[PDB]
Amino acid sequence: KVFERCELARTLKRLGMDGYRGISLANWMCLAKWESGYNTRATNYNAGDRSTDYGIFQVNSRYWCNDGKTPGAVNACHLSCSALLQDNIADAVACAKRVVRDPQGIRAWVAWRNRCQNRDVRQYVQGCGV
Ligand code: NA
């Protein structure tokens, strides 16, 4: 499923992402935008290390979910990576929450540092009623 901007903003809000571990809703929107373009079935293989990024938040199989084919990987979210490709983002959100519980926080995603950090991210939620 490819979410519309405001549809996603309202969904993330009801799933309790606004201010989760000090991360504003607009930051989560900026992250999803740059990671997958609001696409829940997005996948990206990293040939250099044999891992794959899954879902709307593009979480890596080496640490967050299990896909079986990634060498020396852990499954911190305790999920099959298939769970992160559903139209319903409940599991993807629960796993994104686990990621930011680590010291790095939102900084764990390099894309956030590149396109979201220290920028005016208001535009991602403006007019959505959240
Ligand atoms: Na894994």
55 neighbors 92 (Cβ within 8 angstroms)? yes
Residues with CB under 5 A from ligand 1 (ion): 61, 66, 73, 75
* E-only strand ranges, the chain: 43-46, 51-54, 59-60
Measured CA to CA, the distance from residue 63 to residue 99 in angstroms comes to 9
Q: Which two tokens stand for residue 85?
A: 């490709």
Measured CA to CA, the distance from residue 25 to residue 10 in angstroms comes to 10
Distances (CA, A) of 105 to 36, 108, 126: 19, 6, 24
Backbone dihedral region for residue 80 (phi beyond 0: left; psi -120 to 50: alpha; all else: beta): beta
Measured CA to CA, the distance from residue 36 to residue 34 in angstroms comes to 6
Backbone dihedral region for residue 106 (phi beyond 0: left; psi -120 to 50: alpha; all else: beta): alpha
Alpha helix positions (H), the chain: 5-14, 25-36, 90-99, 110-115
**Positive or negative CA dihedral for 10, 90, 33, 120?**
positive
Resolution of the experimental model, in Å, one decimal: 1.8
Question: From which experimental method does this structure derive?
Answer: X-ray
Measured CA to CA, the distance from residue 112 to residue 14 in angstroms comes to 22
Q: Among all chains, which residue has been given the structure tokens 């993807």?
A: 92
Domains detected in the chain: 1-130 (1.10.530.10)
Q: Among all chains, which residue has been given the structure tokens 């607009």?
A: 26
The SS3 of residue 88 is: coil
Q: How far is the CA of 122 from the centre of ligand 1 (A)?
A: 34
Q: How far is the CA of 35 from the centre of ligand 1 (A)?
A: 19
Residue 97 DSSP label: H
Q: Which two tokens stand for residue 32?
A: 């999803």
Query: CA 86, 90, 91 angle in degrees (round to 5)?
Result: 70
